[PDB]
Amino acid sequence: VYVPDEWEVAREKITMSRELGQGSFGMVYEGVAKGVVKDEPETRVAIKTVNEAASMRERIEFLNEASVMKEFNCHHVVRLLGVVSQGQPTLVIMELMTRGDLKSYLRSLRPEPPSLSKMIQMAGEIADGMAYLNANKFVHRDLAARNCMVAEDFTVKIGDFGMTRDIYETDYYRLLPVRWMSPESLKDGVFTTYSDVWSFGVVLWEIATLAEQPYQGLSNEQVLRFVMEGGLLDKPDNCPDMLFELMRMCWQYNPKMRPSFLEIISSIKEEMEPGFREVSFYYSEENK
Numbered sequence: 264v265y266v267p268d269e270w271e272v273a274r275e276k277i278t279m280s281r282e283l284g285q286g287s288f289g290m291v292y293e294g295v296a297k298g299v300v301k302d303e304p305e306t307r308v309a310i311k312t313v314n315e316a317a318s319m320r321e322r323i324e325f326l327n328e329a330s331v332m333k334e335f336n337c338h339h340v341v342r343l344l345g346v347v348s349q350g351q352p353t354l355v356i357m358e359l360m361t362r363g364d365l366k367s368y369l370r371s372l373r374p375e376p377p378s379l380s381k382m383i384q385m386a387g388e389i390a391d392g393m394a395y396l397n398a399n400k401f402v403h404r405d406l407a408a409r410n411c412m413v414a415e416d417f418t419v420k421i422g423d424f425g426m427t428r429d430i431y432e433t434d435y436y437r438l439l440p441v442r443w444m445s446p447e448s449l450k451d452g453v454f455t456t457y458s459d460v461w462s463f464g465v466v467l468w469e470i471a472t473l474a475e476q477p478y479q480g481l482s483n484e485q486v487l488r489f490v491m492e493g494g495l496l497d498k499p500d501n502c503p504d505m506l507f508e509l510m511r512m513c514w515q516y517n518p519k520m521r522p523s524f525l526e527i528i529s530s531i532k533e534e535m536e537p538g539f540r541e542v543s544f545y546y547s548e549e550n551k
């Protein structure tokens with residue numbers, strides 16, 4: 264039973280320019296919202312709509328999942344700006360990421376690549392956002408280049424998690440990214456910070472291959488068998504040892520033996536850009 268609040272915005276103030284493509288619950292539009300940002304009368308925003316093929320059960324799921332993001336304030340996690348809970352379509356307005364998803368972006372760099380220092384940068388930003396989320400007791404469950412977003416200034420941020428969330432799970436039992444999923448996720452549907460770290464390893468591999476499909480030539484059923492039986496992605500051609508060392512740490516079959524996101528950041532903080540100190544969660548007062 265969603266209760267409107269602070270975050271509720273008048274539908275009047277919102278303007279939907281053009282389609283950006285399908286996200287978790289429905290179409291995401293580019294647009295403009297009046298007075299959703301302080302010291303900014305009008306703001307360029309992304310607007311996700313729940314389609315009209317949406318059960319009340321799903322329209323409520325949409326708002327509650329969005330509402331999780333109300334508690335989030337992190338430079339490396341895409342920000343919620345406001346909610347339109349009354350009337351249809353139900354809107355969730357958020358920070359517009361003007362260079363789209365990291366997968367598309369990485370695909371665009373293919374024989375027109377990124378330097379080692381530019382890849383470490385992406386890794387640390389993603390790791391920092393994920394460290395922030397795990398600090399706020401949140402497991403993403405769908406970390407992947409396609410759900411990392413790129414800002415105007417090339418900052419990478421943690422994006423859509425909706426895609427994997429069922430309406431019923433927790434209380435009752437009845438969509439899985441097998442190529443990004445840890446063995447314990449594939450075997451038992453266990454999703455923890457440590458499973459998110461596995462996915463993070465796969466995103467490094469995506470970054471180093473400019474978004475090849477992980478385990479290409481294996482079907483989804485084959486990947487499920489292969490990874491559960493200790494299968495691993497081959498080190499990409501001319502992948503820096505720095506990075507492949509990180510992938511190996513993330514792909515420890517046993518979750519206990521995987522590094523935390525903080526440990527990952529510690530291991531690369533030397534090679535991070537100077538700015539990262541001011542914007543990051545890692546260096547923030549909020550970090551433990």
Ligand SMILES: CCOc1cc(-c2ccccc2)nc2c(F)c(-c3nc([C@H]4C[C@@](C)(O)C4)n4ccnc(N)c34)ccc12
Binds near residue numbers: 329423
């Ligand atoms: C950390 C959690 O972050 C999120 C949670 C959510 C979200 C999760 C559950 C319920 C409701 C919303 N939804 C997000 C989102 F829709 C976007 C988003 N998607 C796209 C489209 C889709 C495409 C076609 O792949 C590119 N965008 C284009 C431009 N700017 C965007 N911000 C953006 C980004 C981040 C999101």
